[PDB]
From a paper:
In this study, SgfSL has been used as a model system to determine the transport tunnels connecting the TNC with surface. The structures of SgfSL, and its mutant forms with sufficient occupancy of copper ions, were obtained via the cultivation of the corresponding over-producer, the E. coli strain, in a medium with a high concentration of copper(II) sulfate (1 mM); in the case of cultivation with 0.25 mM CuSO4, the laccase crystal structures were deprived of copper. Using program Caver, we calculated one T3 tunnel (we referred to it as T3α) closely approaching the TNC. The side chain of Ile170 significantly narrowed this tunnel. The second tunnel (T3β) emerged upon rotation on the side chain of His165, which closed the shortest route from the protein surface to the cavity between Cu3α and Cu3β. In all the available structures of 2D laccases, the histidine is observed in a “closed” conformation and width of the proposed tunnel is 0.71 ± 0.09 Å. We suggest that “open” and “closed” states of the proposed T3β tunnel are provided by the mobility of the imidazole ring His165. Based on our results, we propose that mobile positively charged side chain of histidine 165 acts as a “gate” in the tunnel that transports oxygen molecules to T2/T3 center.
Laccases (benzenediol:oxygen oxidoreductases) are copper-containing enzymes that catalyze the oxidation of diverse compounds by molecular oxygen. The active center of laccases contains four copper ions: A blue (Cu1) mononuclear copper center (T1) and a trinuclear copper cluster (T2/T3); the latter consists of the mononuclear T2 copper ion (Cu2) and two T3 copper ions (Cu3α and Cu3β). T1 acts as a center for the reception of electrons from the reducing substrate, while the TNC serves as a binding site for the molecular oxygen and its reduction to water. Three-domain (3D) laccases are monomers consisting of three cupredoxin-type domains. two-domain (2D) laccases consist of two domains and exist as homotrimer, with the T2/T3 located at the interface of domain 2 and domain 1 of neighboring molecules, and T1 located near the surface of domain 2.
Numbering used by the authors:
A (entry chain C): 41 to 317
B (entry chain B): 41 to 320
C (entry chain A): 40 to 317
Write the structure that this text describes.
C-alpha cells in the first residue's frame, strides 16, 4: 500500500458544467460534475494532459496550485489560457521528484496536497467561479508514501463546507483502525480554524511525523485562509475508539452557523456508541 | 529539571462556578475558580480522571484538545457528556508516548501545549461558556523535556486577554536568566498575531530548537485563530537584559484597543531599568 | 553567487525618517532618498549595527525591530522613552548572535531569519499611523553558509495595498529564467492575507529551501500571514515552468479583485517574456 515511482504520461477529459441553483462544477464525464470536483491523484514525475471542455455559456478556466505548468496552462485571461463558451483546450500539468541541483542545493519535489479551481468566472481571479463550486483537489504522491483506505475532501468555501447548506455536514464513515486521508482546502474571503475531535495530526507534508526526529508540531486545530491546502492521514479511533467524532471550524460564529460535520467511526460490528441524530 | 516518564494514574476534582462580573470559571477547589482555569500538567503516558462538579444553574461541559478520550468524555451535548446544573461526572483523559505501528508508520505522542474549555454554554459549541471564561491550559510533557522556572498562560479571548478589561495586562515578572514558559491559547471569533519584544522562539512543539539540525522557523510573531494553542520557553532577558518587555497582539487596532501586556524582566536586585509604570 | 560568511562585524549606518509625497512617510539611508519599503538591512549572524537615526519630520518617530537582539534602550517605544523627537537624533543598536549550546545543555536559537523594522509611535503608541504611512522595511540576518541570491525583492502587504502602491499597480519584479531570487514577505496593518505565486513553490521553514531529503517542512505556494509576520524564501525563476508573466497576489478573493496583484516577470535569456503584452 505505497505509492510507486511516477513518470507516466496520463490523459483525462474534464468538463465545466452548470449545476442547479446557479452553481458550477468540474466533472470527468458529461453530466457527472461535482462540488468539489473529481480528486486527481498523481505520482511525482507524472504528466497529466487534461482535455478540457467548457459546456457552459460563460468563459471558464482551469488553474492549479503546486504542480509544474507552462504559462500556456496558466488558466488566466492575462495569459490567454481560458476556455471560451463551448470551447476546448488541453491543459498540461507536470510533476517532478525532489533532487539535488547542480548548485548543491536541494530542489523540492511536487508532492503534496494541492488543488485546482477556476480563474476567470465573475472576475479575472475566478471569484465567481470559486463561489459557484469550480474547485477540486489534486494529490501528488512521493515514492513510498503510504496509501490510505479512503480519502475525503473538505472545502471551507466561505461559510460553507463543499458549497452545502448550513448544518448538513458532510459526514464521513470509517471503521476503527482505517487509514483515512483528509484533504482540506479553503476558498473565498474568510480565515478558518479546522478542528477534529479525538484525533490529531502532524503539521507537515503527509500529516504524519517521519519518525522520532521530526520536530513538526502535532496539532488538532489549524488556521487556514483562502487557497490554503493541506492534508493528513489518521487512524480512525486510534487510542479513542468508535463514536460520532465532530469536526468543525472553531471560529465560534462559524460552527454556530453550521460549519460542522461528523467523522462517524464504527466498531467492527458496525455500531457507533451514543450516536443519535 | 527534566520531565520524567509518565504512566501514572492521576485524579483531580474540578468545579465550574459563576464568577464576579457575569463570568464563569473552572477551579480545582470549590470557591476557587479562575480565568484562565487551573494549569494541568501531565507526562506522556499519564491518565487523568477529572471528578467534575457543575455548581451553576445551566448545563456545562469539559472538552479537551489533543489528549486521548473516549467519546463518553467528549464533553458535547450531542452525545450526553455534558453536566447538568448541580450535577457531577468523571471525565477521563489519557495520553500516550510516541512509537511505531505494525504498518511501519510512526504514531505521534500526546506531548504538546493543549487546552480545555466548555462546549455547551450558550451554544452547542460553548460560545457563551468560552466567552464567559470557561477555558484553561493543559501541558503534556515528553520524557526529557526541559522544565521551566515559571509558567504563564496568555489567552486571546475575542478582544480580551484572559477576559480582562482593556489595557490591564496581565503583566508577568521574571528575573533575567529565568527559564520562563508561556502557554498561548486563542478563543472566540477573531484572528490575532501574538508578538513579544526582545525575545524569540522556535515554531515547533516545544518552542526550542532540538539542535543544529532543526529547520523550524524562529519567530517573534505568530498568527493564531480560535482554539489555536502553542507554547515555548525563553530565557528571560537573554542577550537583551532586564526591562519592561511588551507583548501584544500585533493587529494594529487590537494593540491600540488594549491587547497589550508587560513581561517585566528584573535585574537580580529586583529593579527594572527604565520602567516608569505611568508611561506604559 | 556565494554563501554567507561568518558574522561578527560592527557596522554603522545613518538612517532618516522623512515625509514623502501623498502624506506618506519613509525611512532612508541618505537624506532625500527615503523609500517605501525602507532600505533592506542585511547582516550576518554575530554582526552589530549602530543605526545613527535622525527624525527629519515635524512629529515624533521611532525605530523598532523584530527578531534581533536589542537592549531596552533601543526598544523604539515611547513607553520605554526610545522614540525620537522632531528634529532629534538617536543611535539605535541592534545585535545578532549565532546559535549554540547553552550551559544547561539546551540549544540557543540564532538570530538568522527574515525580519523587519517599523515605527512604533506615529499616530498611536503602537505606530499604527506610521505603519500606514509607510515606515516599515526589511531586515535579513544570514547564517554562515546560507545560499546567497542574485536579487532580493521585498513585498509588504500593508492593509489592502502592496508596498503602499495604488490598487493594481504592482509592483512587478523582473528576473531571467534560472535566477536565484529571494523574496522577503512582510505583512502589516489590520487584515490577514494569503500570499500566492503562480508557477513557483517554496518550503515553509527558516530559509524557504529544503535542507535536503530528510527535511519534513511543507512545500507550499500559498501562505496565510497576519500583521507583523515576516517570512522569506528563495526560488529559481521559471524552474520547471519556463519564462512568462507569472502572477503573484493575495488569494483573499476580494483582495485580489481590489488590487493586491503583481507580476513576477521571468524573461528568457534573450530578454523576452513570451505572451506578455504591457
Ligand atoms: Cu491566481
Ligand atoms: Cu470558519
Ligand atoms: Cu476539540
Ligand atoms: Cu488559487
Ligand atoms: Cu468541538
Ligand atoms: Cu488581536
Ligand atoms: Cu517588537
Ligand atoms: Cu476547542
Ligand atoms: Cu510592539
Ligand atoms: Cu489580502
Ligand atoms: Cu496559482
Ligand atoms: Cu512589530
Amino acid at each position: 500500500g505505497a505509492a510507486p515511482a511516477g513518470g507516466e504520461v496520463r490523459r483525462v477529459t474534464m468538463y465545466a458544467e452548470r449545476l442547479a441553483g446557479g452553481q458550477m462544477g468540474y466533472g470527468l464525464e458529461k453530466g457527472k460534475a461535482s462540488i468539489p470536483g473529481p480528486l486527481i491523484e498523481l505520482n511525482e514525475g507524472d504528466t497529466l494532459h487534461v482535455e478540457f471542455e467548457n459546456t457552459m455559456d460563460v468563459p471558464v478556466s482551469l488553474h492549479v496550485h503546486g504542480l509544474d505548468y507552462e504559462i500556456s496552462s496558466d488558466g488566466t485571461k492575462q495569459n490567454k489560457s481560458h476556455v471560451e463558451p463551448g470551447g476546448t483546450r488541453t491543459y498540461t500539468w507536470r510533476t517532478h521528484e525532489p533532487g539535488r541541483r547542480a548548485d548543491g542545493t536541494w530542489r523540492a519535489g511536487s508532492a503534496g496536497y494541492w488543488h485546482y479551481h477556476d480563474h476567470v468566472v465573475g472576475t479575472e481571479h475566478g471569484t465567481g467561479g470559486i463561489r459557484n463550486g469550480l474547485y477540486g483537489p489534486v494529490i501528488v504522491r512521493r515514492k513510498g508514501d503510504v496509501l490510505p483506505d479512503a480519502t475525503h475532501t473538505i472545502v471551507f468555501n466561505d461559510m460553507t463546507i463543499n458549497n452545502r447548506p448550513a448544518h448538513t455536514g458532510p459526514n464521513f464513515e470509517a471503521t476503527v483502525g482505517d487509514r483515512v486521508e483528509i484533504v482540506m482546502i479553503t476558498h473565498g474571503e474568510y480565515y478558518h480554524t479546522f478542528h477534529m475531535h479525538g484525533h490529531r495530526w502532524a503539521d507537515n507534508r503527509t500529516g504524519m511525523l517521519t519518525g522520532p526526529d521530526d520536530p513538526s508540531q502535532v496539532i488538532d486545530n489549524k488556521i487556514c485562509g483562502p487557497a490554503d491546502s493541506f492534508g493528513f492521514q489518521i487512524i480512525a479511533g486510534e487510542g479513542v475508539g468508535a463514536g460520532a467524532w465532530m469536526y468543525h471550524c472553531h471560529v465560534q460564529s462559524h460552527s454556530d452557523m453550521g460549519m460542522v460535520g461528523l467523522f462517524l467511526v464504527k466498531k467492527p460490528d458496525g455500531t457507533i456508541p451514543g450516536y443519535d441524530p
